[PDB]
Amino acid sequence: EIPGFYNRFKTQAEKSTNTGLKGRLAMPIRANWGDVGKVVTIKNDLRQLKNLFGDDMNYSAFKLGKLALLGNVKELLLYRLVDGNQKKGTLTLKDTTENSAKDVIKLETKYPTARNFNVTIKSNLVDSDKKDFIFFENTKQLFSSSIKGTIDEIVLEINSNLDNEYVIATKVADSDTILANVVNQALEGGNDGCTSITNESYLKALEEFERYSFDSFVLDGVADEALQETTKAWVAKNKELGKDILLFLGGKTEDNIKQINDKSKSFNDENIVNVGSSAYYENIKYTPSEVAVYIAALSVSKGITGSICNAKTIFEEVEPRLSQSEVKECLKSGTLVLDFDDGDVIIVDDVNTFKKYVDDKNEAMGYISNIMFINTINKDTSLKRKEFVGKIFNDATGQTTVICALKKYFEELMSQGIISEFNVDIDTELQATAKADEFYWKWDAVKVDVMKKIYGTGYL
C-alpha cells in the first residue's frame, strides 16, 4: 500500500463469547415453511429456527427443533421433507387503466408452504398514482409499502425490503398502468408439507444427509418401524464407510414397556438408542421419539467430559412411570427411559440398546458416553488421515512422527483428565505382515469413569 498509518479496528467479538454449547445433530423434518431439498445448518438461537422454518407446533420441524435447541446443540442441521406435489403459494395482480386488464405482477411465497399469507393493495391517500402494498398472514400484517403506478419500481421495492421476505414479486408484463386493488388476498396454489409423506421421502433425506458429518441422528421423532430398520442399515453402512454416526430412536406411544424392551432387544448395535418414556414440557405430551430428539441433543451437547445418567431434563412430567424393578428390566433390555427421581424429570442412565450383550463389546460400550468417546477418537484419527496418508515415506522417521502426533493427541486428552491411563505404540505384530505402503499401530486407554452408584454406611 501507500505509506501511512492505516488503522483497521476489529472489536468484533472482543468478549461477547461463551462456551456453553457443543455438538451437531441431524434432523429430517416436516415443515409448513422454509427451504426444501437442502440440508441447512441452524445456530442454537431459536429465532433462527422460527425465521427459517416458521413457528407452527403442529409440525415436526418447529417442535423438534425447539427440543433440540433446548438440548443445547451448537449447530442444528435440518432438512425439510416433502412430497413432490408440495408447492409454493401464489397470487397475481392486474392493471386497471385498460378495459382489457392484463396481469402485470405475480406474488409467490419465498418458501414452499400452504399458509394463508395475504396481501392488500389500496389507493394511496397522499399521492394519486401510488398504491399502498400491505402484506399479512391471516390478517396479521407483515409489511406495508407505497410505490407509484409503474410496475418495475413496484416489484423492485416489493423485492427490496427484507420485511417482505415472506414473498417474492415478479413482473408479468412491462406496464406503466395503475394496479388493481386487492384486500387480504391469500397467496393460493401452495401445498403444505405434511401431504403424503412416506418412507421414500425419509430415504431421500438420509441420502442427502450422507454428505455431512454428525454427532447423532434421531429420525424426525417418528417411530415407524420400516424407517427404523432402514436407518439402522444406513448407519451401519456409514460406520463401515468411516462415518461414525450415532442413532437415537423412540418407540411408539402404544407400545408397552414389554414391547419397548423387545424392540430394545431387537436393536443391539451400539450406535442404536431406544427411548421408551413419554414426557410433557409445556403441558404438551411428547412421544418417545419426540423426546428421543431431546435426549440425543443433550447427549451431543454433553460431548466428552460428561454423561446423561442423571442429567436434569426440561420436562415437567414423564410417563409411563417405573418402579425399580421396571427400571432394571428396561436397563437390562438396553432401553433408555426417563425418571422422576425428584420433583423434576431426570434421565435414569447412560444405557443404549446394545447393553443386552456384555463381554466382547464391553459393558462400557453399553453406555452412550463410551460410544461418543470412541466415535470422537475415530473421527480425530480419520482427520489425521489427510495429514499423514500419502505425505510421509513409511520409514522409521515417518512412523515416529505419526506415533509422536498420536501421543501428543492422547496426552492432550490426558491433560483434560478424560483418560486415566494410556499407551500408543506401533503394532509390530501386524507391522511385520504389513505391506510396504501401509502402517499398523495399536493403542490402549482407560476412560475416566463417573459415579453412577454410591453407597454410604453410618456409625453413631
Add this chain to the structure above:
Amino acid sequence: TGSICNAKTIFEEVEPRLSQSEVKECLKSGTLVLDFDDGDVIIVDDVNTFKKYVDDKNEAMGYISNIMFINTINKDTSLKRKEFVGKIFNDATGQTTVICALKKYFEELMSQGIISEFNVDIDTELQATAKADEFYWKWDAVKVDVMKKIYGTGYL
C-alpha cells in the same frame, strides 16, 4: 519425494461419485478417479492404466510415482551418457570411474531417503559377452514407500 494418492485438489466438486465398490472397480481397471473423502475433492490413489496387470511389470509400476522415479533414473543416466560415452577407455579404470559416479548418484538419492537400499555393480554376466567397445552394468534398489493404507486397533 511425493505422490498423489491423497493430494488435495483445488476442485470444489467432483462427479460421478463412487462408493468403495466403484472405487475398487476403477482401481482394478487402472482408472484414476477423484474422490470426495472430505469436504474437499481428494485424489483417490496413485494408480495408472497399467495396474490391471500385476507381476512382471511389478505392482509398484502400477503406481505413477514409481514410473516417475524410473523415468528420472533413466533421464539422469542418459545425461551421464555424454559424460562417459566416447570419453573413457573401457579399461578397469574407466569402468571403476563409471561405477563410482553412479554410486555417488545413488548415494545422493540415499541421502534424500528416497531409496531404502541399493547396490550397483558391473554386469559381469553380460560384460563377459560384451564387445570391447561397450559396457554393461546392473543395479538393484528399493524405493521408500508411503502410507496408502493404515489400520488401528483399540483396547479400553
Add this chain to the structure above:
Amino acid sequence: EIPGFYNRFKTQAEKSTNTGLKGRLAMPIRANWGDVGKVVTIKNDLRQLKNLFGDDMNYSAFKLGKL
C-alpha cells in the same frame, strides 16, 4: 484395500479374563431336556447347563453337572 486410515477396534476381552479354571471332563447323563446323541461341550457357567439340559435335579444331568 483402497487407500485410507481404517480403524478396527478390538476391545473384546481387554481385561475380562481370569485363570481360575482348568481341565475337561466326560459325562454320560440322563436328562429330561437337551440335545440327544451328541457330545456337547459346556462352559463352566451353570446357566449354560441350565439352558441346554434343563434344571431338574431328579435327573443325573443337572445334578452331576452342577457338581
